[PDB]
Amino acid sequence: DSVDYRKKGYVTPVKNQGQCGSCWAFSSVGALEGQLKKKTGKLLNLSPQNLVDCVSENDGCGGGYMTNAFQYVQKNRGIDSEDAYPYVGQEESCMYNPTGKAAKCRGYREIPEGNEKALKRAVARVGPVSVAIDASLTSFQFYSKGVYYDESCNSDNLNHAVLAVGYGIQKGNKHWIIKNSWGENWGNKGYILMARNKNNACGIANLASFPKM
């Protein structure tokens, strides 16, 4: 009835984007990392910079789409390890190095728009899934515990990319387990529990995708 990939080694430590709107990059690498574990039995930190500086279809620190990232990794025939291409919190010139290649991608799939059931199936059957949400509310930002729900959250304002690393229930409230990229300091050790099956709250199923490996 539930699943938490953190327990399974599919999830890396919580990262911090700093002063850069690279949430999409962190989300993409997170999905990629999960697939790396699943396919190879092990993972490592992949490099968000590689995406920031090389995904021309995206806007660097100005925002991007996870799908464009997955596409780049496939076309490029690889993505670098973090250690290989470290994160500096600003966009720089593309310095991808094949010597550093730590994962590959053979494409991607998008979850059917608005369908939480499909999202649950994807998390169960694939592993961690890249998602986008409205993270603009004061209440989201000061989150610390419980299952987050705020009706004013706007499902049509997907301003922040994150990663669904599981799903479950807590004190009768169904939820998604969500990995953020605002440091371990934010939320519950970098994570937030977000309401599930409550009319696609915060647009959680609006822009969901995963990489094929």
Binding site: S22, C23, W24, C61, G62, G63, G64, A132, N159, H160
Partner: peptide, 4 residues
């Protein structure tokens, strides 16, 4: 979605 501007996803940052």
């Amino acid at each position: 979605x501007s996803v940052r």
